[PDB]
Amino acid sequence: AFVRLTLPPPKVVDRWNEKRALFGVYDNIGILGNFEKHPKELIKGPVWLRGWRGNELQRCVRKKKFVGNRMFIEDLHNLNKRISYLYKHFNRHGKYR
Amino acid sequence: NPGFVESVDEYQFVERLLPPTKIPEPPKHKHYPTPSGWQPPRDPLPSLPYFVRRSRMHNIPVYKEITHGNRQMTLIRKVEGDIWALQKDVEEFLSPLLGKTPITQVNEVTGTLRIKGYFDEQLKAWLLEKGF
Amino acid sequence: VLVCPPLRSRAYTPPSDLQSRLESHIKEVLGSSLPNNWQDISLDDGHMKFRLLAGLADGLGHAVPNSRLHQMCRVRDVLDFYNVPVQDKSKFDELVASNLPPNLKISWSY
Amino acid sequence: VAKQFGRHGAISGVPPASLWPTPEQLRELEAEEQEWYPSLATMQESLRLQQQALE
Amino acid sequence: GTSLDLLRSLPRVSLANLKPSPNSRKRERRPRDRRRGRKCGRGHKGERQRGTRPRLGFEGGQTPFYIRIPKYGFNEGHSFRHQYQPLSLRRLQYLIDLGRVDPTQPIDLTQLVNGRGVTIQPLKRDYGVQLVEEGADTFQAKINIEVQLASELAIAAIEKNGGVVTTAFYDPRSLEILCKPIPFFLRGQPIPKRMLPPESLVPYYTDAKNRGYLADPAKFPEARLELAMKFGYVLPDITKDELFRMLSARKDPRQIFFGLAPGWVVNMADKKILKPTDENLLKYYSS
Amino acid sequence: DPVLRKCELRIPVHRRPVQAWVESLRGFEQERIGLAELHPDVFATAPRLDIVHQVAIWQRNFRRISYANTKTRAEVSGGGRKPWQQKGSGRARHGSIRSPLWRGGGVAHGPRGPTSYYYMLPMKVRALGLKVALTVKLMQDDLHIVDSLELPTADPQYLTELAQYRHWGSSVLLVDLTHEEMPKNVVAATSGLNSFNLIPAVGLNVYSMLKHQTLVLTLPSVAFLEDKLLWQDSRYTPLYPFRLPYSDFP
Ligand SMILES: [Mg+2]
Ligand SMILES: [Mg+2]
Ligand SMILES: [Mg+2]
Ligand SMILES: [Mg+2]
Ligand SMILES: [Mg+2]
Ligand SMILES: [Mg+2]
């Protein structure tokens, strides 16, 4: 193998920036806020997986439900083929029956 | 002319339907024990080194438990104070029935005492007399 | 024109006579001229607890921690608590001034 | 729109009378009721005939 | 406690000091080292080793076990069968004892569910509560209760103390409103009518011996007396009782709630109850 | 006039209350202006650091969405044709130039799309972690109860010096009852400070109480927190979400 001959530039992490300092605030908005808002409403991410979790086959199907009709032709073709690949694996292949 | 008529005289029955979120404090009874069998903790409080608290439903927190389908256990929860003192008392209390010292586990972090075998009935009456 | 006072030390050593200093405060706060059995007087009263503890902290300088307030049930506890000295010296600091053997040398790089 | 009245009452702006069935809606309900929910008298009469045949 | 005193001495709790409960997590094993690598737990080469063993229930080519057994209607119509949650007099007494079911006012399925005494699931085909005789010997409460089903001995326990038990049928739609009335008032719809029992259940609810809500009231006193003689207790005249009005209170067979007529709208926000005025709409609901 | 506070809800008969010194930020030396009583079941629960670990994990993992992705051999450009014939070449058999073995081929087992780590702990468990965390700050002498957050000056120098004089930590977390009413003097000074963070009482959480060394609570927030956390201990299970009308719940 070959190795770097010089030390990489020192990496600096500022631990008291606004994002790190105020991380975790409004996570008890429900119990401490009379349950008007669930904390899962505070998650930022893809439309199909806010407040939700699943295996890859489940994630593929759920993305199709939410944005399937707004997807590009090439992407929808790939997404559909991934569903069929994962369907045949999880339902026909593996050690355990 | 609107096809309706507003009233404020029947909103007593709607209020009757609203549900509570807090478990009510048990009502005072003239004579104890109550016909179900429930009896509140005695006052003045017991002076033992340990205190056993009641559940939110105002019952003695003794639970029969089973694992593996054959390991029978009884569990005393919500134990405050010297959890080790409570074990000594239980061992003396249950030894005559068994004829040998009972096997127990003390979980000091959770504050619970775990005993091998089913002894919930004897251990609930026992606690009632101590006033817990 | 708010100017911070000098930072105080966290070291406390029991005064010459706690009973004398303590009883004087109790007499002032209680005002009955030291009724017998004073040591066993309960501090459950909030106003009495504040006056006794607050005054002692100002005089001696050492204050009861928030963790230990509930323990000061009776005057005995307050007297006992002020009997324990408090030292700001670290465990390293003690070694330096501990008459070390001549083959032991320690240096502070901080 | 109804959901807005139940939650917020009058301030929703839903005209109260719009919360009840409309004339044409009412006719549908009654016609459906007759077809599928018989009256008590008819049910007892139907029950009696079955018992007589069984006897 | 002594535990909290230990915290006082110990260093600060912080994100750098965290630890899970011991044995809380198992360690996952990757197929990397010699112990778990190589053939990787799958065995020597073969169908089961490549991952292509047949489906569950296949037995290598003989008619499987779950196919050679005659087909039989154990579960026919299971989704259509009616289910009645069982309530025992022990549970009823226990709920009253701790104040969770108030005996002063009439007891209906709303109050029972409202006190977390029973859990009703209309989606799973619950159509009400059946009273259970268990606990009758120790039952010593005088209460007015409405339950979709009741037993001969369960009725005797209630009446012997001087209480009143009646059996009333609630349709699948009515029950859901009855169980969770407030998640309905918020919709904004008028209160629907209560539909009559199906033809199969009509005899049960029109019979006095079962205390049917559609039964002939004149025939109750005979039924009450016969039950009293059979179980060796003296029937108590409840008219003399001070709280007779509460005991005798009964909702109309087309009514879901005690004080609310079909067709009204409950403006919970304004604490009002909008009521109709139209004639055809009033004739529809009053029918 | 000592500022004396008592728990509004009934303390269990067998447990005596816990107390703390009420403080004021109006001056450097106004350390003890009142004596306060704190519900033992909030500020004197058993020390459970496994639960604090559980809650701290949840606050850091349910929000996580990983955007790592890789192309599989089906999604890599090209690859349809067989490179060479199977037989009569002396070469290794191949069916595509985009298999995982080839340079530039697909990834066999890589990250697949956006993934979520979302889960929810029981509501009682997360409420407990706020009780356990509050005990830890009190018993470790890091919690400072204050009557109000009013400050004589808005210069950030004052707040930092006050923290040093009183032997507070390098980082201080300040809590006020509601965002709308928080005093202007406090907003101006804390806005420019990295280590001193001011949040409303509804934002208090286990993760932020472990990141900040010392906790500063106004007296109204103490009553605010005690009510919410204790309510969890004598409550039924929810019939329907707690935002729907209930007999006795706000
Ligand atoms: Mg694995
Ligand atoms: Mg069920
Ligand atoms: Mg291809
Ligand atoms: Mg081809
Ligand atoms: Mg191929
Ligand atoms: Mg590539």
From Swiss-Prot, chain A:
Subcellular compartments: Mitochondrion
GO cellular component terms listed in the entry, alphabetical order: mitochondrial inner membrane; mitochondrial large ribosomal subunit; mitochondrial ribosome; mitochondrion
GO MF assignments: structural constituent of ribosome
Keywords: Mitochondrion, Ribonucleoprotein, Ribosomal protein, Transit peptide
Leader sequence segment: none
Gene Ontology biological-process entries: mitochondrial translation; translation
Family label: Belongs to the mitochondrion-specific ribosomal protein mL51 family.
Subunit structure: Component of the mitochondrial ribosome large subunit (39S) which comprises a 16S rRNA and about 50 distinct proteins. Interacts with OXA1L.
UniProt-recorded name of the protein: Large ribosomal subunit protein mL51
Naturally occurring in which organism (per UniProt): Mus musculus (Mouse)
Swiss-Prot record, chain C:
Alphabetized UniProt keyword annotations: Mitochondrion, Ribonucleoprotein, Ribosomal protein
UniProt-listed GO biological process terms: mitochondrial translation
Signal peptide region: none
Subcellular localization: Mitochondrion
UniProt main location, coarse: mitochondrion
Known partners and oligomeric status: Component of the mitochondrial ribosome large subunit (39S) which comprises a 16S rRNA and about 50 distinct proteins.
Family: Belongs to the mitochondrion-specific ribosomal protein mL50 family.
Protein name (database record): Large ribosomal subunit protein mL50
Gene it is expressed from: Mrpl50
UniProtKB/Swiss-Prot annotation, chain E:
Pfam families with a match to the protein in the record: Ribosomal_L27A
GO molecular function, one term: structural constituent of ribosome
Basic residues composition-biased segments: 24-43
Keyword terms: Mitochondrion, Ribonucleoprotein, Ribosomal protein, Transit peptide
Quaternary data: Component of the mitochondrial ribosome large subunit (39S) which comprises a 16S rRNA and about 50 distinct proteins.
Region (Disordered): 13-59
Domain of life: Eukaryota
InterPro entries: Ribosomal_uL15 (IPR030878), Ribosomal_uL15/eL18 (IPR021131), Ribosomal_uL15/eL18_sf (IPR036227), Ribosomal_uL15_bac-type (IPR005749)
Name this protein carries in UniProt: Large ribosomal subunit protein uL15m
From Swiss-Prot, chain F:
Coiled coil: none
Main location class: mitochondrion
GO cellular component, one term: mitochondrial inner membrane
UniProt region (Disordered), positions on chain: 75-95
MF (Gene Ontology): structural constituent of ribosome
Keyword line: Methylation, Mitochondrion, Ribonucleoprotein, Ribosomal protein
Any one GO BP annotation for this protein: mitochondrial translation
Record-listed Omega-N-methylarginine modification sites: 103
InterPro entries (UniProt xref): Ribosomal_uL4, Ribosomal_uL4-like, Ribosomal_uL4_dom_sf
Subcellular location: Mitochondrion
Disulfides per UniProt: none
Subunit-structure text: Component of the mitochondrial ribosome large subunit (39S) which comprises a 16S rRNA and about 50 distinct proteins. Interacts with MIEF1 upstream open reading frame protein.
Family to which this protein belongs: Belongs to the universal ribosomal protein uL4 family.
Official protein name in the record: Large ribosomal subunit protein uL4m
Taxonomic source organism: Mus musculus
